[PDB]
Amino acid sequence: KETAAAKFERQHMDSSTSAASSSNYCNQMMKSRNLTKDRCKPVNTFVHESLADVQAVCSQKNVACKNGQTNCYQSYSTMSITDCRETGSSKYPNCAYKTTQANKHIIVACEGNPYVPVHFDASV
Ligand SMILES: Nc1nc2c(ncn2[C@@H]2O[C@H](COP(=O)(O)O)[C@@H](O)[C@H]2O)c(=O)[nH]1
């Protein structure tokens, strides 16, 4: 089945655009990446950098994840991201999102060999 590394790329990577270019960004990208198939996912961040630069995070600053695990890493640089989160109008299967574009450090958790990101923890 899909691996956790492919799942993080599908859920979180958008190196095709530099930033969200309209208020409809998250509605179109949450539907097209299949993240509203079973239920509206309520929050989801996309990162607008190359895949190499996000895989490099797993060699930068180790930090504790929100839930206490110690395989999270925080980016040294800020990155261009879009935060999508559900709005009061959202109702399955017509999931609805507000798009917020921002430049933040990312914190991801890494696993495997090669050791790559498999979960988006937070933006700070
Ligand atoms: N699992 C996951 N959490 C995220 C993502 N983007 C942001 N978050 C987290 O979701 C939080 C906001 O969710 P909440 O505060 O409503 O449960 C932020 O504090 C951050 O920790 C994402 O793509 N996946």
Short mmCIF file of C-alpha atoms and ligand atoms in Angstrom, two decimals:
data_model
loop_
_atom_site.label_atom_id
_atom_site.label_comp_id
_atom_site.label_asym_id
_atom_site.label_seq_id
_atom_site.Cartn_x
_atom_site.Cartn_y
_atom_site.Cartn_z
CA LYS A 1 0.00 0.00 0.00
CA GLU A 2 1.14 3.62 -0.09
CA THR A 3 4.07 4.25 2.03
CA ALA A 4 4.23 6.83 4.81
CA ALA A 5 6.88 8.73 2.86
CA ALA A 6 4.61 8.82 -0.32
CA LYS A 7 1.64 9.80 1.92
CA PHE A 8 3.58 12.80 3.31
CA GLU A 9 4.42 13.91 -0.26
CA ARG A 10 0.71 13.54 -1.38
CA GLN A 11 -0.63 15.32 1.72
CA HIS A 12 1.91 18.07 2.19
CA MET A 13 4.11 18.80 -0.85
CA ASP A 14 3.27 21.38 -3.49
CA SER A 15 6.56 22.33 -5.25
CA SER A 16 4.39 23.35 -8.33
CA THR A 17 3.40 26.66 -6.91
CA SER A 18 5.25 29.23 -4.82
CA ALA A 19 2.41 30.17 -2.63
CA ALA A 20 -1.51 29.83 -2.65
CA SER A 21 -2.74 32.14 -5.29
CA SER A 22 -6.46 32.45 -4.33
CA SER A 23 -8.91 31.83 -1.51
CA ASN A 24 -9.93 28.56 -3.31
CA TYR A 25 -6.41 26.99 -3.03
CA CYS A 26 -7.15 24.72 -0.11
CA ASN A 27 -10.62 23.63 -1.37
CA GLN A 28 -9.14 22.51 -4.74
CA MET A 29 -5.95 20.97 -3.26
CA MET A 30 -7.67 19.12 -0.32
CA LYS A 31 -10.14 17.53 -2.91
CA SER A 32 -7.43 16.77 -5.62
CA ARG A 33 -4.94 15.17 -3.15
CA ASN A 34 -7.75 12.88 -1.94
CA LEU A 35 -7.69 14.21 1.65
CA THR A 36 -11.58 14.60 1.76
CA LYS A 37 -12.30 11.03 0.42
CA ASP A 38 -13.64 9.54 3.62
CA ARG A 39 -14.13 12.61 5.84
CA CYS A 40 -13.10 16.32 5.79
CA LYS A 41 -9.52 16.36 7.26
CA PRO A 42 -9.78 19.43 9.49
CA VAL A 43 -6.34 20.93 9.23
CA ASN A 44 -3.61 20.28 6.68
CA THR A 45 -0.45 22.24 5.71
CA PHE A 46 1.11 22.32 2.28
CA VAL A 47 4.74 23.28 1.75
CA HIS A 48 5.82 25.11 -1.42
CA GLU A 49 9.45 24.06 -1.64
CA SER A 50 11.48 21.48 -3.40
CA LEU A 51 11.16 17.92 -2.08
CA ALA A 52 14.90 17.87 -1.49
CA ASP A 53 14.83 20.92 0.80
CA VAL A 54 11.98 19.31 2.90
CA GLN A 55 13.73 15.94 3.04
CA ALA A 56 16.76 17.86 4.32
CA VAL A 57 14.91 18.84 7.47
CA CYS A 58 15.54 15.40 8.85
CA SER A 59 19.25 16.39 9.22
CA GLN A 60 18.64 19.81 10.86
CA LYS A 61 17.48 20.61 14.40
CA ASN A 62 16.17 17.75 16.43
CA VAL A 63 13.29 18.71 18.68
CA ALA A 64 10.54 16.97 20.53
CA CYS A 65 7.32 16.50 18.62
CA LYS A 66 4.03 17.84 20.12
CA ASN A 67 3.23 14.41 21.45
CA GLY A 68 6.74 13.96 23.17
CA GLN A 69 8.40 11.69 20.54
CA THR A 70 11.99 12.72 19.79
CA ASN A 71 12.18 12.01 16.01
CA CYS A 72 11.01 15.53 15.04
CA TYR A 73 13.19 18.13 13.32
CA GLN A 74 12.67 21.82 12.94
CA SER A 75 13.78 23.63 9.75
CA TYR A 76 16.63 26.08 10.11
CA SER A 77 14.98 28.37 7.50
CA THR A 78 11.44 29.58 7.19
CA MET A 79 9.52 27.97 4.32
CA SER A 80 6.56 29.03 2.20
CA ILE A 81 3.49 27.15 3.50
CA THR A 82 -0.28 27.22 3.21
CA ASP A 83 -2.38 26.29 6.21
CA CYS A 84 -5.81 24.93 5.30
CA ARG A 85 -8.46 24.54 7.91
CA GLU A 86 -12.09 23.69 7.79
CA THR A 87 -14.72 26.43 7.99
CA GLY A 88 -18.07 26.65 9.74
CA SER A 89 -19.72 25.90 6.32
CA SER A 90 -17.91 22.67 5.72
CA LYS A 91 -20.22 19.72 5.42
CA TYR A 92 -19.18 16.27 4.02
CA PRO A 93 -18.80 15.62 1.14
CA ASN A 94 -18.59 19.36 0.39
CA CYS A 95 -15.66 20.05 2.67
CA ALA A 96 -14.78 23.70 2.88
CA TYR A 97 -11.45 25.35 3.92
CA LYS A 98 -9.97 28.76 4.68
CA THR A 99 -6.57 29.28 3.00
CA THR A 100 -3.84 31.10 4.99
CA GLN A 101 -0.46 31.61 3.28
CA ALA A 102 2.54 32.21 5.52
CA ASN A 103 6.37 31.75 5.89
CA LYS A 104 7.18 29.66 8.91
CA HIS A 105 9.67 27.11 10.18
CA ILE A 106 8.31 23.55 9.75
CA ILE A 107 8.60 20.71 12.23
CA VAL A 108 8.30 17.20 10.78
CA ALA A 109 8.88 13.74 12.10
CA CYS A 110 11.31 11.48 10.21
CA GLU A 111 11.58 7.74 9.88
CA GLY A 112 13.33 5.02 7.74
CA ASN A 113 16.39 4.68 5.55
CA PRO A 114 16.76 6.80 3.70
CA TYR A 115 15.44 8.81 6.64
CA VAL A 116 12.72 11.10 5.31
CA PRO A 117 9.68 12.99 6.63
CA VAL A 118 6.54 11.06 7.31
CA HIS A 119 4.32 13.39 9.38
CA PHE A 120 3.81 17.20 9.51
CA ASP A 121 3.89 18.28 13.15
CA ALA A 122 3.54 22.07 13.30
CA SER A 123 4.62 25.37 11.82
CA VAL A 124 6.30 27.88 14.12
N1 LIG B 1 -1.33 16.52 11.78
C1 LIG B 1 -1.19 17.77 11.24
N2 LIG B 1 -1.24 18.74 12.11
C2 LIG B 1 -1.10 19.96 11.59
C3 LIG B 1 -0.92 20.22 10.24
N3 LIG B 1 -0.81 21.57 10.03
C4 LIG B 1 -0.93 22.07 11.23
N4 LIG B 1 -1.10 21.14 12.21
C5 LIG B 1 -1.25 21.30 13.68
O1 LIG B 1 -2.58 21.50 13.83
C6 LIG B 1 -2.65 22.51 14.91
C7 LIG B 1 -3.96 23.22 14.84
O2 LIG B 1 -4.85 22.15 15.17
P1 LIG B 1 -5.59 22.18 16.59
O3 LIG B 1 -4.97 23.42 17.23
O4 LIG B 1 -7.05 22.69 16.05
O5 LIG B 1 -5.92 20.71 16.85
C8 LIG B 1 -1.39 23.34 14.91
O6 LIG B 1 -1.06 23.56 16.30
C9 LIG B 1 -0.36 22.28 14.41
O7 LIG B 1 0.19 21.73 15.60
C10 LIG B 1 -0.86 19.18 9.32
O8 LIG B 1 -0.68 19.19 8.11
N5 LIG B 1 -1.02 17.87 9.88
#
